[PDB]
Design a protein around this ligand. Structure first.
Ligand code: ANP
Ligand code: MG
Length: 378
């Protein structure tokens, strides 16, 4: 009875398993522990994850992402109508429900959001079975704490379509606290703040744990703020640099911009552990190579307003929970963007020097807690 914990994120998806007293965050056959939440359709095949993401510039109208923003919602929902303006793929109305419309093997096909996510879940299932050498059926799947019943049910249906037996849908911030064993600290009630900065979204949650029971006191954040905005600032920075050096604008070459974006995302990650990072792109535009660098200070300066602004949802969450910052017992970092040293410094300063829970890889913390929960329930 091996059950997995699955964090289905807006930008990336993670799968873990708790075995013999340790959580393994499962890497795929190329050694990558993360699967982009991307699905693509071509003349001949359906691509999932990095295979789909890697060809997005060549096949933009048939490469689907952000299905988590659509799942469980209705077509006339203002959220859906606003987000549709930013996607290169078609979203159509089927009897009040949104469907993504694509060309696939020469035919027009449409998929519900939970069908798109089930394809990502199918890959997660195969990744875990590749690692475990066994059939994997039971799963705990996480969702943001603000998801309503429709979004929870549709996320569960995505698991069911993938052949998974979803033991339970649990909140992402609750999974994070479970990962740190915060419900097992026997004592008085604990106020826990989860600071979740991902690729596309920023979620602040305050939970209270009394006698080991989780209760969501408040939620705040920004559904369109994440690591991708910081990448955007880098891309604009290097587009201006390239124009300054070569008097040429690469903006309208989708492949060039995509290759610059990929380099920028990778450089950003390096700047979390190094004070400088190199950009190396052969023949970026009209045969010209782009070899340059960026310091951590410049990356921080390019994003200073976005970084500082993450504290306003923290203040709002505390206001709604009717708690002073000093009443928070544990601060938990979640999401890949919280590895940014400036974000950690801003949040720890905000809490008057209080140490942050961050020893679990923040982009893995939700899948870690989901995997523990899956073992408890199976
Ligand atoms: N070491 C790092 N330093 C800085 N950013 C990082 C690092 N590792 C990952 N990221 C960024 O973290 C983001 C992805 O975080 P992750 O938590 O894995 O996505 P997610 O779970 O899909 N969250 P979300 O998109 O908000 O639903 C991307 O923008 C990455 O570039
Ligand atoms: Mg996540």
């Amino acid at each position: 009875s091996p059950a997995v914990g699955i964090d289905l994120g807006t930008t990336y998806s993670w799968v873990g398993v708790f075995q013999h007293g340790k959580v393994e965050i499962i890497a795929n056959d190329q050694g990558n522990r993360t699967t982009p939440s991307y699905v693509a359709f071509t003349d001949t095949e359906r691509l999932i994850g990095d295979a789909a993401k890697n060809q997005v510039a060549m096949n933009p109208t048939n490469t689907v992402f952000d299905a988590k923003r659509l799942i469980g919602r209705r077509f006339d929902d203002a959220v859906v109508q606003s987000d549709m303006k930013h996607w290169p793929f078609m979203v159509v109305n089927d009897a009040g429900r949104p469907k993504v419309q694509v060309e696939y093997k020469g035919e027009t096909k449409s998929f519900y959001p939970e069908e798109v996510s089930s394809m990502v879940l199918t890959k997660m299932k195969e990744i875990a079975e590749a690692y475990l050498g066994k059939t994997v059926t039971n799963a705990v799947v996480t969702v943001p704490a603000y998801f309503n019943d429709s979004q929870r049910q549709a996320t569960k249906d995505a698991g069911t379509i993938a052949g998974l037996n979803v033991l339970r849908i649990i909140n992402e911030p609750t999974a994070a606290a479970i990962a740190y064993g915060l419900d097992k600290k026997v004592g008085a009630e604990r106020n826990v703040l989860i600071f979740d900065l991902g690729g596309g979204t920023f979620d602040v949650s305050i939970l209270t744990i009394e006698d080991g029971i989780f209760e969501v006191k408040s939620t705040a954040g920004d559904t369109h703020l994440g690591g991708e905005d910081f990448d955007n600032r880098m891309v604009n920075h290097f587009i201006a640099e390239f124009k300054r050096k070569h008097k040429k604008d690469i903006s309208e070459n989708k492949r060039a911009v995509r290759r610059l974006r990929t380099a920028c995302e990778r450089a950003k990650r390096t700047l979390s552990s190094s004070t400088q990072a190199s950009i190396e792109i052969d023949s970026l535009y009209e045969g010209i190579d782009f070899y340059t660098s960026i310091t951590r200070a410049r990356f921080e300066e390019l994003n200073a307003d976005l970084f500082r602004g993450t504290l306003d949802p923290v203040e709002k969450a505390l206001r709604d929970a009717k708690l002073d910052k000093s009443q928070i017992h544990d601060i938990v970092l979640v999401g890949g963007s919280t590895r940014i040293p400036k974000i950690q410094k801003l949040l720890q300063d905000f809490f008057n020097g209080k140490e942050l829970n961050k020893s679990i890889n923040p982009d893995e913390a939700v899948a870690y807690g989901a995997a523990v929960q899956a073992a408890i329930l199976s």
